[PDB]
Amino acid sequence: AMNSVFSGLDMLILLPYERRGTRLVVEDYRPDHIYCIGADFGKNQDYSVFSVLDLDTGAIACLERMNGATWSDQVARLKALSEDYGHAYVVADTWGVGDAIAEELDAQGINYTPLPVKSSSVKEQLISNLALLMEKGQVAVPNDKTILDELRNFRYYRTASGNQVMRAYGRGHDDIVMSLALAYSQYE
Ligand SMILES: [Co+2]
How remote is the CA of residue 178 from the centroid of ligand 1, in Å? Predict the structure, then answer.
C-alpha cells in the first residue's frame, strides 16, 4: 500500500516458534543474554501484548497475547514472563492503564520502566525507531500471520490540521505493533 508505515517488511527476519497457549515461544531463556519486555495492556476487550526481546541478538524470544484478561492477570502474566527471562525489565505503556494496574506493577515488585505513549510525537519516535531497525535487517519476530498482518496494516494518515497519524487500516488493532516498538526502543 502507498501509505504503509513498515515499508521494509521484506527485511524482517521471520522465526519459527512453538505456540504454548497465549505464548508464541521462539527461544527459551538464554542465561548469558539480557532481555526486556515491551508491554501494552488491554482495557475492556482490547488485546494485551508482551514481547520479549533478547537485547544481545535483537530477536524476539517470546510474544504473549490475549484479550479479556483481568487487570491483575495481565500484571501476573507479565511478572511470570519477566521472571522466565531472568527478571527481564519491562518497558510498559502506562498511559491510560488506570490506577489499579500502576499500583499493581509497584505492589508486585515488577522490574519496569514507564514509557507512556501519550502523544503522536512519542508514538512516532517509537515507530520510526522500529521501522529504521527493520529496514536495517535487525528486527526478528515470530513467523505468525497475525503479527505480520498487523505490521502490514499499520498505515499513515493525516489529521484535520494536517498532522501525521499512524494507525491500523480500517478498524484494526495495533497492540502487537506497539508492544514490538516498546521492546525495540531499548535495542542498540
Ligand atoms: Co493496545
Answer: 7
Structural domains in the chain (count): 1
What is the spatial distance between Cα 25 and Cα 21, in angstroms, rounded to a whole number? 10
Q: What is the CATH number of the domain that holds 179?
A: 3.30.420.240
Residues with CB under 5 Å of ion ligand 1 are 40, 175
At residue 123, the 3 state secondary structure works out as helix
Is 10:25 a contact under the CB 8 Å cutoff?
no
Give the experimental resolution in Å.
1.6
Way the structure was solved: X-ray
CA dist., res. 55 & res. 33, Å (int): 7
- What is the number of other CB atoms lying within 10 angstroms of the CB of residue 100? 13
State which amino acid sits at residue 99: D
